Write a protein that binds this ligand. Structure first.
Ligand SMILES: Cn1cnc(Cn2c(=O)nc(Nc3cc4cn(C)nc4cc3Cl)n(Cc3cc(F)c(F)cc3F)c2=O)n1
Ligand SMILES: Cn1cnc(Cn2c(=O)nc(Nc3cc4cn(C)nc4cc3Cl)n(Cc3cc(F)c(F)cc3F)c2=O)n1
Lengths: 301, 301
């Protein structure tokens, strides 16, 4: 029993984290096989970071301009190239700790683990979700650039996020490992700000099922709603539309608990309309939306 | 910016996790140097687990009764002994991945990371606190026995918890790595239940400082209270007494924010007396008490 914000074990990722320095600019890199991946922002000097032309900046660099440190061992850079917003530094040594891995891009509403890293040294691990506005509500300080987000499936690390920058609201923006930003952001100083966000409805329902599995039942009721009638209410509260795809994905949790999805939607409707009235669900006084149906099934069974 | 339930990177602990089987009973063990540590409950058969005499059960076992598996490698057991509620199995191979480590016992209100493990295979990592009733609000399923809790200081893993059992309320009980239970619990079937718990006041204050560091200031006020007057109010709400020791520990956060501890106590008093009125602090609608002052300083600076 119990339900926690649970991350994947981070060891397979810790073994790939390195420090990359270009000039006086330093950040974190990801060392897989004989390649180090890092944000291309590392090639900016303080005068470049505002409005850089990255193709110009990279043409002006040599392999010897990049210092890659794996612990107390320098890795010799023998090639460099840029793929969108990530730099690829070919090194003369394959990482012996390379796990089985993939580069996958995730969807808003999906979750991943973040290994926060400073000067190539891992500091902490936490769980977060990609928001509907393609930001993440992370926890990052100066020096965290290049930290990565990932999921683990069996033995395979699926890397899905590399951290670039903090937006004015304190939320975070980054790329997939192909260098393509999540959301309408660029790796330079502009007026960019996060767009409007919504509550991830299917995740809230998954978490209500987690609560029932853990014996929190006070919010259940005898009612069932239609999908259309639920969506009419949920949108008024800035909740994402619930689809038949979402209902289908919640099927296993509905089976384990014996509560149909549209029956649980009637609980959520009442919680939205009435509040929680001084009570809690799984130790929270808010409706939590950063657990996916798969996260709940993984943790509760 | 940002504030998350953040665990320590778990790789140093993953490299020590093994599976221990005695008869048909299986659980997780911790392999450090040439010793495997695990709950002594592993020597119980289904008929023994209710009311065992462990000294009797261990005298009836041989080294060959213990199967220790480190991944796909069997470790040869060459000695066995029991220290309180933990079994020590001496193996013929020192773990090459042994980190620098200590066995430390923690205090109620302190936090640690948990590496949840099943069949010797790490599954997830999360953060929790030792409660005042010496339980933890963990997330554990069948097969998690022997999972460990730890903190990391520089390069040194301080192991502080090994998981034994789930109590009827769904909270969790275990030992330090010397085999000594946290709280008045025993590794057998009795009427044992968790005693009354309290809110960890110094942690709530630390988290309010975290909120201020992150720009959440709506709960601040012009007032300051005395320590005695705060404690008179906080106890009515089942909060632990605040001591001058706690005030002193909060000094660094008070300095960074420029808010005296007794000034912040006046905010907490008002939050307790008035509620939160539909607003949130660091994304929560409750006062969070599982971040220590050290956790806040580590994460916010
Ligand atoms: C508070 N916070 C939360 N997340 C972050 C991530 N982050 C970062 O770690 N570093 C950044 N700028 C740098 C300054 C450097 C100074 N030296 C010596 N080396 C440095 C390296 C960097 Cl990367 N930034 C800012 C930033 C990073 C980008 F990748 C980008 F495209 C635009 C930006 F404004 C940063 O956000 N800090
Ligand atoms: C739901 N939950 C949450 N935490 C836990 C931890 N936990 C556990 O993992 N296993 C336990 N009993 C076993 C049965 C076995 C069956 N086989 C084949 N092997 C087994 C090994 C164990 Cl350890 N228990 C119960 C339990 C474990 C103790 F160490 C103890 F002293 C008393 C107990 F009732 C358990 O709580 N499950």
């Amino acid at each position: 029993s119990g339900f926690r914000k649970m991350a994947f074990p981070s060891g397979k990722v810790e073994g790939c984290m390195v420090q990359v320095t270009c000039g006086t600019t330093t950040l974190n890199g990801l060392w897989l096989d004989d390649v180090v991946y890092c944000p291309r922002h590392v090639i900016c000097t303080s005068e470049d970071m505002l409005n850089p032309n990255y193709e110009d900046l990279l043409i002006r660099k040599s392999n010897h301009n990049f210092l890659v440190q794996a612990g107390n061992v320098q890795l010799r850079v023998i090639g460099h190239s840029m793929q969108n917003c990530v730099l690829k530094l070919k090194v003369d040594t394959a990482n012996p700790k390379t796990p089985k891995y993939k580069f996958v891009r995730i969807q808003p509403g999906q979750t991943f683990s973040v290994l926060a890293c400073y000067n190539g040294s891992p500091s902490g691990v936490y769980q977060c979700a990609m928001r509907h506005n393609f930001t993440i509500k992370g926890s990052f300080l100066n020096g965290s650039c290049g930290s990565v987000g990932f999921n683990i499936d069996y033995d395979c690390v699926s890397f899905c996020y590399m951290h670039h920058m903090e937006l004015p609201t304190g939320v975070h923006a980054g790329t997939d490992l192909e260098g393509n930003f999540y959301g309408p952001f660029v790796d330079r100083q502009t007026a960019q700000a996060a767009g409007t966000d919504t509550t991830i409805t299917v995740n809230v329902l998954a978490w209500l099922y987690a609560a029932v599995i853990n014996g929190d039942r006070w919010f259940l009721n005898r009612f069932t709603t239609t999908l259309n009638d639920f969506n009419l209410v949920a949108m008024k509260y800035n909740y994402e539309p619930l689809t038949q795809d979402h209902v289908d994905i919640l099927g296993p949790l509905s089976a384990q608990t014996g509560i149909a999805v549209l029956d649980m939607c009637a609980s959520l409707k009442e919680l939205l309309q009435n509040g929680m009235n001084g009570r809690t669900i799984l130790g929270s006084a808010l409706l939590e939306d950063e657990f996916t149906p798969f996260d709940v099934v993984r943790q509760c069974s």
